[PDB]
Design a binder for this molecule. Sequence first.
Ligand SMILES: O=S(=O)(O)C[C@@H](O)CNC1CCCCC1
Length: 211
Amino acid sequence: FPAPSEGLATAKANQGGIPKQVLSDASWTYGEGAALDTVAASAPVLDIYFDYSCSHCAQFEGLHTQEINQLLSDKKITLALHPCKLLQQEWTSVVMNAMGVVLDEAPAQSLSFHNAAFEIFSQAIQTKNQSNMTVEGLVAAAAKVNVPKEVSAKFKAAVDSDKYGKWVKLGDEAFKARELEGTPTVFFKGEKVDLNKLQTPTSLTELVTGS
Ligand SMILES: O=S(=O)(O)C[C@@H](O)CNC1CCCCC1
């Protein structure tokens, strides 16, 4: 697996059990394919290593989702999302199986679904009401972001069969290979980002634009 300093440096996994658009390091991306004669082609890579069951990742997503979406709309970053199961929680496999179905069948709603799955976790942390940390809760999150019903109907079977277990295994393999220490871990243009400097909802924007 290429070093983080290499950025987006793998081809598609092209394997059974792994979403079709996922790369060989388990990541997936937004904004990488701009034409080279466009300002959009200058979009440097922002890599985010995360676990769906990590509270720090949930907080990160809540704080930065608006500006990450804005940076993508403004064609200022290529976003690369790198999943793992560092915390060894089965919730991560549940979410990854539902996310795999979304990636494969409703990719237009994938980034919104990512946010929504983290929102479930954030709300549970705050309230101690864990009742939505289920397949049925993810179906509801998918409806909230308008994943088609025919797609979210496939979540239970994917979860029950661990359809995307190979993807979960690959994300952990990639995280280990690169000897990363915790989640989240963020790189920008291949350089480590100090998470302690990202404490506002515009802090990634400031980093990307040089302030
Ligand atoms: O090449 S572009 O930058 O025009 C588009 C490219 O980022 C699309 N990638 C994701 C992949 C899987 C989830 C949905 C979109």
